[PDB]
Amino acid sequence: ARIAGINIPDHKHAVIALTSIYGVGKTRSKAILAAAGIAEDVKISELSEGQIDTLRDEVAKFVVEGDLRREISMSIKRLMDLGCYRGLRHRRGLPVRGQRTKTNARTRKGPRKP
Amino acid sequence: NQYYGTGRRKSSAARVFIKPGNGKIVINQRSLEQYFGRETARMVVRQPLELVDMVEKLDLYITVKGGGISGQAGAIRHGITRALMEYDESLRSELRKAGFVTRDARQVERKKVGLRKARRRPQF
Amino acid sequence: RSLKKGPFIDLHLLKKVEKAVESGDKKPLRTWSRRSTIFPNMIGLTIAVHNGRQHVPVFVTDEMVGHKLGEFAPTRTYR
Amino acid sequence: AKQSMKAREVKRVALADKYFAKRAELKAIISDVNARWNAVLKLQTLPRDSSPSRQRNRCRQTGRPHGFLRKFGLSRIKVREAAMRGEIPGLKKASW
Amino acid sequence: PRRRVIGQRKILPDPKFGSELLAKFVNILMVDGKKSTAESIVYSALETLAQRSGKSELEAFEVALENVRPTVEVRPVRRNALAMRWIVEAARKRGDKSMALRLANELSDAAENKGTAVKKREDVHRMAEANKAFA
Amino acid sequence: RIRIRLKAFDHRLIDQATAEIVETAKRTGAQVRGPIPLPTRKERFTVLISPHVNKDARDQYEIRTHLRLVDIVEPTEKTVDALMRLDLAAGVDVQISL
Amino acid sequence: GQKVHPNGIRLGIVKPWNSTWFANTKEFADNLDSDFKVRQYLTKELAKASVSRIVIERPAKSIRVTIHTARPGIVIGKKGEDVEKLRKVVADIAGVPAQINIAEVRKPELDAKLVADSITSQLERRVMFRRAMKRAVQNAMRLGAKGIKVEVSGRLGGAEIARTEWYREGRVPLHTLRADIDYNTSEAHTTYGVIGVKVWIFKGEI
RNA sequence: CGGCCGGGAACUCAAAGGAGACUGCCAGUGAUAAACUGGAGGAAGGUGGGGAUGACGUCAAGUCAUCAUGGCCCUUACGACCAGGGCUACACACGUGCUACAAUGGCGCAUACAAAGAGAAGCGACCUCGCGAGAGCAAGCGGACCUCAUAAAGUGCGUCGUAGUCCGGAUUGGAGUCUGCAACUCGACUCCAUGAAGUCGGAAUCGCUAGUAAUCGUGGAUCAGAAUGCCACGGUGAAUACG
Ligand SMILES: [Mg+2]
Ligand SMILES: [Mg+2]
Ligand SMILES: [Mg+2]
Ligand SMILES: [Mg+2]
Ligand SMILES: [Mg+2]
Ligand SMILES: [Mg+2]
């Protein structure tokens, strides 16, 4: 099952096995299995060519895994060439969405740099 | 007129009626087994009646509002004993040895000033 | 993400848009306001954003679609 | 108290009751979907200090913006002062 | 209690087997006030161990309490309280899946009673009969 | 047929105010139900007693508002004058409707 | 400081309020604002009248105001000026309808606003203070007052430190809520400081 | 099939006055006295439990920033007015807290049990569209009637079977909504996708004697908009005291 990238998930319920691939999560998984008419309590055992390519076509109706990555990259390049406040915080590693820079921003700032 | 005891316990209030029929359960039109007769502390309604023959000797009818599960259960526990002025006062010696006549005074305590939960002095 | 149904723009900046477009690149454009949203008619303009004491000469590029003035001009000198 | 700030808040009420609560129909009906005539959001900018959003609702006798509550108007200091001098019907220290 | 003696305000016993000791035990294993998800694990573990012991029910842990009963540190109330506490906090450390089954494996090793419960007992019980000077 | 709802604070004020409206009702009146106590929706406040720091020194107060309701049904025109002019409205306000 | 205030706690117990109207939850703030207006302006115009205390009442959208004083002759006057002018400017504050009354305070030294305003007005008359404390204690104690004490505070006689020297005779059960207690507080303004005086009066049991 | 119409007046419910708990009677100890233990009944036992109630004084503790107020200082400027930036910056330490690190857990479905509150420039049922966060309509409610609103752990079933896992939710891209002139310096929420460290915490350190310790919800005040903060209420509900 070389679908959507390198992931061959196995022995999972498909409702989580579709979250297992980058760029696709829970609600998208539920909608894909509804559009393919697949029960939630199935396993990846006994899977066929139809059960590959119907899933891949229904997810190829969606933005996945390569162009999403370079879309994030192109948004970041657009903000850096913009030189906005948010672009400056993206380029210098500071929390963008209205946080406090003073205390406890270590997800964005990394570990403590003395 | 019907043999009645009110009974109340920890923000609950029951209404307990006794006929001399059979000891099966109607609660807000529901089974004991459909309220907690399978679940936790199932025989807290049965416990005062255990001291005599109780199985099918008297009909019982309870309408309760207020509190939670054990609040209503303790309200029943007190309401049955409250309604036990039907037969006599003179079965209640071993009932006082059980102490079930005692109206509960273990009321909850208020949130006080400068504290988080009612006795909780915060850390410093 | 914001500004539900019709954005909010500025009176005098809106006027100075036509005061520069219909009358040529006289000066850089001077506003004490940092609010209005960039529309593609504004391409080719030197405007000024005041940061607290000082103006920055903002030029507008094509990909400034839903973007904002003070979002282009931060107001904190660092280090 | 800064009686200057007191007179400011007087002006904040006095300009408010002239325009707003009555000319706010412009935001209400016309700045709303009727399906365009965008001249009303062109005209959207007003003298704008008549908005009660710019009103603090300070203390009444002292003009402090803290101690305040809309039920009494005076700050909590004057609440205690008056409440202990009497001065409020049906008010005493709570107890349960 | 610098001044007062106990009155030991009591509780209600077990529903099914009617043991006040088991009621104290579900009070022990209770955290955050959940007798129901205590007792489901409790009665499921006890109904496993009844089959896994082939004996009665109440003696099946009377054995498991007497054999993990220490001597000193002492009074029997603290003995049969710390015994149950020892069984709980012994089963807390096990790498098994569920609480009832790790309690069952702890009681099995306390049935062939060289378990981690008597391992925890026989350090204070080791200080006993080896440091008999202090009084 | 009438909804007469009386409003005051002090209980000692309002019960001796309403005793002589109950007696005025059933002295020469008709279809009188009794004064309804109408549980006090008293309002509680807790405010900082220090001007400065010590948040943990505060002070609690409450305001207790009593109400009454009359509910006379029969159109007792004989006693509607007896209820008028004997108001002696010592700080009690009513609202009346259906 | 460290004490609770004794007047606003004995309210529904042994000594009622002196403002017991009823107002709606909307315009209550403007109501008490106007009440503060009449308190301030009444005390200001009746500086030398020695106002004991005043009652605000709202008898069905009018305002009843009662003036308790031991000195009503200066309030009444020659029946034309010193009452109806007061109710007139009370009405002229916000167009509100006004009734007005007085109330004789018998035993004319047993109000603490009277005692504290006496010492307040007697400070700037350039005397010493222990004489006046002794005076008030002796004369109210011979003329009644089952308990009494004083407290002064701040800048006494040009000294550096704010000394107190509270002074008592009688019996003042401050915790005991049944005790009939008259109490107020006035404030002076000297040429170099602001003095605070508290004064407790114990009438009786219940 | 809903307290819903004739109603009953007894019970809940709610507020007025009374009772009652005071060592008041019993035994032993105790100078013959207050007191200690135990008993009876009583719903309640020696303050029934809990709030309010904080003596003289120390700490020249703090508060001229609520206000009053002595003295000083300024008075074409430290005063008065507008626009805009800034207490929300960030190489770092500490305090207060929040959410988890999981299986007593998380998910999905079916699922029963309260309290005190608030409300008119306010609360907002009901229907229709959007998966949803929202928009229009307008009933009622100055209020035990109407609104906030169908609270959650709990129980059965099916589940994931020990992993950085369906646990956890930061950070970030996009698209939204509503508020308010105004969302860049700043918010609140829905959704799509992302899934860092964190597998129980070094030395040290905090609280707590019964409905509390802990856990799970809710309401208010501030407000035009927010809570993990403050104030208040309810559900379940422990251990130990030899000393
Ligand atoms: Mg001033
Ligand atoms: Mg505001
Ligand atoms: Mg006391
Ligand atoms: Mg200082
Ligand atoms: Mg204690
Ligand atoms: Mg907190």
Short mmCIF file of N, CA, C and O (backbone and C1' of nucleotides) in Angstrom, two decimals, chain H residues 35 38 56 65 83 89 98 102 109 148 163 183 201-202 208:
data_model
loop_
_atom_site.label_atom_id
_atom_site.label_comp_id
_atom_site.label_asym_id
_atom_site.label_seq_id
_atom_site.Cartn_x
_atom_site.Cartn_y
_atom_site.Cartn_z
P A H 35 -19.11 22.88 83.94
"O5'" A H 35 -17.80 21.97 83.99
"C5'" A H 35 -16.69 22.23 83.15
"C4'" A H 35 -15.56 21.26 83.40
"C3'" A H 35 -15.70 19.90 82.74
"O3'" A H 35 -15.28 19.91 81.39
"C1'" A H 35 -15.06 19.64 85.01
P G H 38 -17.05 9.13 75.94
"O5'" G H 38 -18.18 8.14 76.47
"C5'" G H 38 -17.89 6.77 76.67
"C4'" G H 38 -18.91 6.11 77.56
"C3'" G H 38 -20.36 6.34 77.20
"O3'" G H 38 -20.81 5.57 76.09
"C1'" G H 38 -20.09 6.59 79.52
P C H 56 -7.16 48.57 70.11
"O5'" C H 56 -5.95 48.76 71.11
"C5'" C H 56 -6.00 49.76 72.11
"C4'" C H 56 -5.09 49.44 73.25
"C3'" C H 56 -3.62 49.73 73.04
"O3'" C H 56 -3.31 51.09 73.28
"C1'" C H 56 -3.89 47.58 73.99
P A H 65 -0.91 61.67 44.11
"O5'" A H 65 -1.61 60.26 43.94
"C5'" A H 65 -2.90 60.04 44.51
"C4'" A H 65 -3.43 58.66 44.26
"C3'" A H 65 -2.64 57.53 44.92
"O3'" A H 65 -3.46 56.59 45.67
"C1'" A H 65 -2.70 57.22 42.55
P A H 83 -7.81 61.44 19.18
"O5'" A H 83 -6.71 61.06 18.10
"C5'" A H 83 -6.94 61.29 16.71
"C4'" A H 83 -5.68 61.15 15.90
"C3'" A H 83 -4.92 59.85 16.08
"O3'" A H 83 -5.45 58.81 15.28
"C1'" A H 83 -3.42 61.69 16.13
P A H 89 5.75 40.90 24.90
"O5'" A H 89 6.63 42.07 24.31
"C5'" A H 89 6.55 42.41 22.94
"C4'" A H 89 7.80 43.09 22.44
"C3'" A H 89 9.05 42.21 22.36
"O3'" A H 89 9.84 42.63 21.25
"C1'" A H 89 9.48 44.06 23.74
P C H 98 -4.37 25.17 38.59
"O5'" C H 98 -4.37 25.23 37.00
"C5'" C H 98 -5.41 25.89 36.30
"C4'" C H 98 -5.27 25.75 34.80
"C3'" C H 98 -5.20 24.33 34.27
"O3'" C H 98 -6.48 23.74 34.13
"C1'" C H 98 -3.51 25.63 33.26
P A H 102 2.57 7.82 29.72
"O5'" A H 102 1.46 6.69 29.82
"C5'" A H 102 0.73 6.50 31.03
"C4'" A H 102 -0.46 7.42 31.07
"C3'" A H 102 -1.76 6.79 31.52
"O3'" A H 102 -1.93 6.81 32.93
"C1'" A H 102 -2.10 7.89 29.46
P C H 109 -21.35 10.05 18.71
"O5'" C H 109 -22.35 8.88 19.13
"C5'" C H 109 -23.04 8.14 18.14
"C4'" C H 109 -23.73 6.92 18.71
"C3'" C H 109 -24.75 7.16 19.82
"O3'" C H 109 -25.98 7.67 19.36
"C1'" C H 109 -23.40 5.29 20.36
P C H 148 -32.38 28.81 27.07
"O5'" C H 148 -30.87 29.07 27.51
"C5'" C H 148 -30.04 29.91 26.74
"C4'" C H 148 -29.14 30.75 27.61
"C3'" C H 148 -28.06 29.99 28.37
"O3'" C H 148 -26.93 29.68 27.57
"C1'" C H 148 -29.15 31.48 29.84
P A H 163 5.71 -0.51 24.66
"O5'" A H 163 6.42 0.91 24.68
"C5'" A H 163 5.80 2.08 24.13
"C4'" A H 163 5.67 2.01 22.63
"C3'" A H 163 5.73 3.35 21.90
"O3'" A H 163 6.45 3.24 20.68
"C1'" A H 163 3.64 2.28 21.49
P A H 183 -10.65 46.02 11.91
"O5'" A H 183 -9.14 45.58 12.19
"C5'" A H 183 -8.53 45.83 13.45
"C4'" A H 183 -7.55 44.75 13.85
"C3'" A H 183 -7.48 43.56 12.90
"O3'" A H 183 -6.15 43.05 12.88
"C1'" A H 183 -8.23 42.84 15.04
P G H 201 8.28 11.27 40.00
"O5'" G H 201 9.59 12.13 40.26
"C5'" G H 201 10.80 11.85 39.58
"C4'" G H 201 11.23 13.01 38.72
"C3'" G H 201 11.22 14.36 39.42
"O3'" G H 201 12.44 14.63 40.07
"C1'" G H 201 10.06 14.51 37.35
P G H 202 12.53 14.66 41.67
"O5'" G H 202 14.06 14.99 41.93
"C5'" G H 202 15.07 14.08 41.50
"C4'" G H 202 16.44 14.70 41.56
"C3'" G H 202 16.72 15.61 42.74
"O3'" G H 202 17.10 14.88 43.89
"C1'" G H 202 17.49 16.62 40.74
P C H 208 -4.04 24.26 55.11
"O5'" C H 208 -4.92 22.94 55.19
"C5'" C H 208 -6.10 22.81 54.41
"C4'" C H 208 -6.52 21.37 54.33
"C3'" C H 208 -6.47 20.61 55.64
"O3'" C H 208 -7.61 20.84 56.44
"C1'" C H 208 -5.49 19.31 53.90
#
